[PDB]
Design a protein around this ligand. Structure first.
Ligand SMILES: [Mg+2]
Ligand SMILES: [Mg+2]
Ligand SMILES: [Mg+2]
Ligand SMILES: [Mg+2]
Ligand SMILES: [Mg+2]
Ligand SMILES: [Mg+2]
Ligand SMILES: [Mg+2]
Length: 226
RNA sequence: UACCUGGUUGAUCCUGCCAGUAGCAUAUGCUUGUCUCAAAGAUUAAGCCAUGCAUGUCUAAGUACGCACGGCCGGUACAGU
């Protein structure tokens, strides 16, 4: 037998500071709104808990002189059940590679979701902090806080991203052509993504400004991989 | 539990309806071991009705010559039922 796998020779400055243990968590990446362009940055921090799920396989096709040329579109949702979630979609000629290329995008689009309390703050937030809305081409999704223990009152499809994001209680609503899974899923993901981009009176303390990870580790980047 | 799913296209995004889904109450089909509770000729013809019953009543205190019984001897407000 043989061993010593040496995958993930990085190609970006962030891959270097992630593979080298210099960077601690992807919260430090989100604080600086950097773009994550390598799917191994995710598996470094998360990975032992990220569970993926194939939401739908959808055969699309173009008419052609000879034929109808079909290829399949895979919608995959991913995320550990403790505050991170993502959703990718890839169109490929065969199913087995669409479902594999979609996991890469679902991992690259992982965002942090915010959770809050409904009535009073006893510990371990359980629901969304406020009423949020999200759209994707005539699909509107409304998320509303709920008391503890109510579960997720929603359709099957939003109650597969809402669970993965870490929310225990939620009242949901939709008013649209919700039968198209692509727009339904993208609008739910958008509503979840708008949960950290909502100014709330606890977010009024002035910002303490830290060093960027590229400024703090200039000395490393100068010659850590070459 | 503040929820959706299939169907117009070669394929996509919509309007929009048809169909699906859960309860409720009238009928009907198949099937039915135990136990408590209990709706029931309203819908249509406030159409027609054989027969039986459903409203009677007395205390010491309105009228007692039924011998209808009956008393200790008879009626003298007159025995009593
Ligand atoms: Mg439809
Ligand atoms: Mg047409
Ligand atoms: Mg067709
Ligand atoms: Mg119907
Ligand atoms: Mg018995
Ligand atoms: Mg009648
Ligand atoms: Mg008669």
């Amino acid at each position: 037998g043989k061993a010593e796998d040496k995958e993930w020779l990085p190609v970006t400055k962030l891959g270097r500071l992630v593979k080298d243990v210099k960077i601690k968590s992807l919260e430090e990446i989100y604080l600086f709104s950097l773009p994550i362009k390598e799917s191994e940055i995710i598996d470094f921090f998360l990975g032992a808990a990220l569970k993926d799920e194939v939401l739908k396989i959808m055969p699309v096709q173009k008419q052609t002189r000879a034929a109808q040329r079909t290829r399949f579109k895979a919608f995959v949702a991913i995320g550990d059940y403790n505050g991170h979630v993502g959703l990718g979609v890839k169109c490929s000629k065969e199913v087995a590679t669409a479902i594999r290329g979609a996991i890469i995008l679902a991992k690259l689009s992982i965002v942090p979701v915010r959770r809050g309390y409904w009535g009073n703050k006893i510990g371990k937030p359980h629901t969304v902090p406020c009423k949020v809305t999200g759209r994707c081409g005539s699909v509107l999704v409304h998320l509303i806080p709920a008391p503890r223990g109510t579960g997720i009152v929603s359709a099957p499809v939003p109650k597969k991203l809402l669970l993965m994001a870490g929310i225990d209680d939620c009242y949901t609503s939709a008013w649209s052509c919700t039968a198209t899974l692509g727009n339904f899923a993208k609008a739910t993901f958008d509503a979840i993504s708008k949960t950290y981009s909502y100014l709330t009176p606890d977010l009024w303390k002035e910002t303490v400004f830290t060093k960027s990870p590229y400024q703090e580790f200039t000395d490393h980047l100068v010659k850590t991989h070459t």
